[model samples]
Target: RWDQSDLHISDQTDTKGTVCSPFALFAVLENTGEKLKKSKWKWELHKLENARKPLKDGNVIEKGFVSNQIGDSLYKIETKKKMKPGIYAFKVYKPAGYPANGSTFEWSEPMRLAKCDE
Candidate 1:
């Protein structure tokens, strides 16, 4: 798709998972730089909903993921930073999955490269 896969617990069927240790974000910024719907998706981070904010007044800095598993992504994120410069916040997604990922995060919409910045 465009941004990342919209994860679902139901996706793990028949899956004998690999011992993956969650890797840092390595997004290509390939699909969302305007070629495909102007990248309306904003990848964000959130605590376990009820897990209490990690820091007082600090935003759970949202990072991007390459797969459909939440928390499975281990981006090179600075988790301790406060919401400095305030509001680099809010997030969303596209209607597709990673095409390179095959059946994993399969790309729903093909990659286009017109206005992509990088």
Candidate 2:
């Protein structure tokens, strides 16, 4: 089983610490060698209640797999539609029944999106 530290998410921001349209989130899987394939993991977007708290399991707003691959380890997940202003986070989880013990999920740091002034 892969540890939580094995997967990570990073935000791509400009000098203002804001992201542009076609907002993208990047994730990387480390230490898995070539045994893990991008298709083996699933990704999701969930509305968060705050920086440290998530609303609930029903908060998931979007779900999918890797949008694009960056080399053999880095992966990209892109949101095609504009998202409403709110707090959210991306989650990556392994398929059920694969790892019968411990945790098979990893979450990204919470990100807040505000309405565009334009």
Candidate 3:
């Protein structure tokens, strides 16, 4: 049962196969945190509701997960216009719990990436 303290953004994007898009963003989980060491509970990845807006908004995407492994889990998304150059992150949570709020669960700490300019 680990906490969200070990979440991070990958330094490099995964560019393999025959994909034209570089997939410039990757969310990662490290094997260290301030919780119960191993997490057996379920988890979910949610996209921020208002990522391009002018507020510190928080929201989750409509993705579902039964359970996450004890180590690392990676998440990403594809867009037609490409990812914007700004701060971005996803809210992690255990959907089975009460309220189903972002505060009650974990988060992949925000990461900033640059696009359109290299």
Candidate 4:
């Protein structure tokens, strides 16, 4: 019911004190047989570490209006929470029933919010 982001960083690349951060673009598809009425989609954020989970979870930090209600297509959700200079990832899960091959994935290069010393 959750997936860590594939976005990774090899080094402290070009990043800064930007308040808002961006996330990968994902896609969800199928509609082979589904419904889209109201409030059926949602996303969660996890830290993406083997021993840890997203600091910001459950509560919709930003861009949390993605309706899982949309069957048979890819969906993209962005994070508005300031990533406090830490490793983070996202997970897209289907609360409703969906076909096997009904989801897609994509992401932007991870962007790090500059720390004080940086």
| TM-score of every prediction relative to native | 0.21, 0.65, 0.38, 0.35
Output the worst ten-in-a-row residue range by lDDT, candidate 2: 12-21
Per-residue lDDT value at 73 in model 1: 31
Taking the tens digit of each residue's C-alpha lDDT, what string does model 2 give over 32-70? 443343334567787877766543445788877653667
Candidate 4 residue spans exceeding 4 A from truth:
1-39, 50-75, 96-118
Per-residue lDDT for 49 in model 2? 77
Cα lDDT of model 3 by residue, 1-118, tens digit: 2353443333223332223343444444333444323432234343444434432334433334323343445423222234544444544443334365546555444444444533
RMSD of candidate 1 to true structure, Å? 16.3
Model 2 error, position 46 (Å): 0.2
Q: Which candidate should be chosen as best, given TM-score against the real structure?
A: 2
Clashes of 1: 9
**Residue-level lDDT for 53 in candidate 2:** 58
Q: Which numbered prediction scores highest in lDDT against the true structure?
A: 2
Q: How high is the lDDT of residue 115 in model 3? A: 47
Of the two candidates 2 and 4, the one with more favorable TM-score, higher being better, is: 2
Instruction: Please give the clash total of every predicted structure, in order.
Output: 9, 0, 6, 19
Better of 1 and 4 by TM-score: 4
Candidate 4, residues 1-118: lDDT per residue as tens digits? Answer: 3332222211222342342334332333223224334334444454432213223334333444454323233334445544554444444444333332445322223334424543
